[PDB]
Amino acid sequence: AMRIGHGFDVHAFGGEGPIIIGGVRIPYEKGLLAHSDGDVALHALTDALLGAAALGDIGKLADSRELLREAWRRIQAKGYTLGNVDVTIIAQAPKMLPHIPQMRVFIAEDLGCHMDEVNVKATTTEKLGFTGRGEGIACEAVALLMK
Amino acid sequence: AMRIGHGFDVHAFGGEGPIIIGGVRIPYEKGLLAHSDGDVALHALTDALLGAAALGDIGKLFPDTDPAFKGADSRELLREAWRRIQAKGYTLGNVDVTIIAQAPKMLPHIPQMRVFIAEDLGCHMDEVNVKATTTEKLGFTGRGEGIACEAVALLMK
Amino acid sequence: AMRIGHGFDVHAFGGEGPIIIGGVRIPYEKGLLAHSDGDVALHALTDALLGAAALGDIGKLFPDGADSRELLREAWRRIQAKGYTLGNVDVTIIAQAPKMLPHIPQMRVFIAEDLGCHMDEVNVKATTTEKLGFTGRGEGIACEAVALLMK
Ligand SMILES: Nc1ccn([C@@H]2O[C@H](CO)[C@@H](O)[C@H]2O)c(=O)n1
Ligand SMILES: Nc1ccn([C@@H]2O[C@H](CO)[C@@H](O)[C@H]2O)c(=O)n1
Ligand SMILES: Nc1ccn([C@@H]2O[C@H](CO)[C@@H](O)[C@H]2O)c(=O)n1
Ligand SMILES: [Mg+2]
Ligand SMILES: [Mg+2]
Ligand SMILES: [Mg+2]
Ligand SMILES: [Zn+2]
Ligand SMILES: [Zn+2]
Ligand SMILES: [Zn+2]
After folding, report:
1. Chains within contact range of chain C (3+ C-beta pairs < 8 Å)
2. C92, exposed or middle or buried, with CB in 10 Å at 0-12, 13-18, 19+?
3. In angstroms, rounded to a whole number, what is the distance separating the alpha carbons of residues C109 and C12?
4. Which of A5, B40, B45, B79 could form a disulfide with A143 if both were Cys (CB 3.0 to 4.6 A apart)?
5. Which residue puts its alpha carbon closest to atom 3 of ligand 2?
6. Smallest CA–CA separation between A31 and chain C, in Å?
7. For chain A, which domains are there?
8. Residues 6 to 45 of C: which have CB under 8 A from any A CB?
9. DSSP C100-119
10. Is the Cβ–Cβ distance between A105 and A139 less than 8 Å?
11. What's the CA angle centered on C70, arms C1 and C88, to 5 degrees?
């Protein structure tokens, strides 16, 4: 059995930087307003993982990495193993690209998997919408689980 | 043989509520402007499902410039859609649905949604995940201009 | 083992039409401002495919009038080299306009061609955002794609 999952998250820029994406501390003029550390990549990912497992979402269960590992724990308890993941960061800024490998390292660790089972990307919305206006950051993620 | 699908839908708020999301009647100050009942979740879901099956989309099967589908039950679209997917030899792996809305509160309605979705697809509920999020007052959903929904689906032969 | 991938792209309207989507020349009053030919459907799709293969994204490969089909083909060649084969793809075009629907069959033809697959393994769809957001106000076109690879 395979299971597909999908995740989406957003946060608004606010306060002083830096910001935290895919566990990576990323220098930026601006900070992320959130009830948590505001790691949209890790959130989207977690929700994807959980959704695949039909465990709902996060609010159904700070440090985004800890949340991620917790979620993963519960997910594994249901009898699931990791197939692969793919993550898509949506931001006008800052530049994500240099940070992608380290992100991957961290996620790989947190999920107990190999790096080759983790993909992270970035794109801009070319100055369009709320991302485009630099109002915030978004991230989508998808996930494949094996039973 | 397995098959991956993806869907996405949006409606504008307008008129009086309530709204219909995942087949569930949800009280709200505002309604959903649509040709149909505006069930944005079932729509996204339907499109992810037809998408995996290479049958195209909702709109192909059920146009917007057709009087028959005025105020149409999105659950009916869904069942039909599904019928057609089965006829093509497919069976349901799983679905994951993500509702994107500042308001109203989706949380309490999610179980009933799943029941509806499960029944319509002839699956077990554990094959169906529905979640909800907001955009933290960002963009068009954030400003409460409307509701969006994504869905992913996995089919099996 | 199965692999899945997810892709997303966006371009802004600008200059004179037409636009190119899923490799199809589509008439329209406006053009697409892009470093490339601005084919969001193929960029999104390429990213989806690259993602599944854990090859990153378009940018890591081809850092930004490029024929987006050429990119797609090259990407696919690298994916193929890495042991992979095509399961299926599914594309979601997000646009107030122009009308995508009649061009969809030809898109699928192109993509199938480019990927070396049968076209039943390629789905393309289109949706509006009902005048909402940047797509809705006719500021741009967006595309999302998912892909499923086999090893
Ligand atoms: N820009 C767009 C948006 C939508 N469509 C077609 O209209 C139907 C309803 O969204 C959809 O089924 C889709 O086929 C289109 O052709 N072009
Ligand atoms: N429109 C919405 C948006 C969010 N939610 C719930 O609030 C939590 C925050 O994302 C989510 O976990 C979700 O449970 C909701 O019930 N309705
Ligand atoms: N906020 C962002 C957005 C995009 N990017 C990178 O720039 C290239 C444009 O697609 C992409 O290859 C993407 O990796 C980035 O580094 N940071
Ligand atoms: Mg949130
Ligand atoms: Mg629609
Ligand atoms: Mg891009
Ligand atoms: Zn969040
Ligand atoms: Zn709709
Ligand atoms: Zn692009």
Report:
1. A, B
2. buried
3. 26
4. A5
5. B133
6. 24
7. 1-147 (3.30.1330.50)
8. 6-12, 33
9. -GGGHHHHHHHHHHHHTS-G
10. no
11. 30
Method of determination? X-ray
CA Rg value for chain B: 15
- Euclidean distance between the first and the last CA atom of chain B, given in angstroms as a whole number: 5
| Residue of chain B whose Cα is closest to the Cα of C137 | B140
- Both structure tokens of C103: 């061009």
Choose the closest CB to C10 out of A6, A84, A126: A126
Count H helices, E strands: chain C?
5, 7
Which of C11, C50, C57 has the CB atom closest to A126's CB atom? C11
Question: Which amino acid residue places its CA nearest to atom 4 of ligand 1?
Answer: C127
Tokens found for residue A52: 């695949």
Q: What is the resolution of this structure in A?
A: 2.5
Distance CA C53, CA C149 (A): 7
**Half-sphere exposure of C119 toward its Cβ, with a 13 Å CA cutoff?**
12
C125 assigned binding-site residue: no
The most distant pair of C-alpha atoms in chain C lies apart, rounded to whole Å, by 45
- Inter-chain touch A7–B152, beta carbons under 8 Å: no
* Rounded Cα distance, A34 and A31, in Å: 9
Q: How far apart are CA C148 and CA B140, in angstroms?
A: 31
Q: Which residues of A109-147 are buried (b: 16+ CB within 10 A; e: fewer)?
A: ebbebeeebbbbbbbbbbbbbbbbeebbbbbbbbbbbee
Which of B57, B58, B61, when mutated, tests ligand 1's pocket best, judged by the most ligand atoms within 8 Å of its CB? B57
B61 exposure class (CB count in 10 Å sphere: 0-12, 13-18, 19+): middle
Q: Give chain A's count of helices (H) and strands (E).
A: 4, 7
Residues of C with CB below 8 A from B140's CB?
129, 132-133, 136
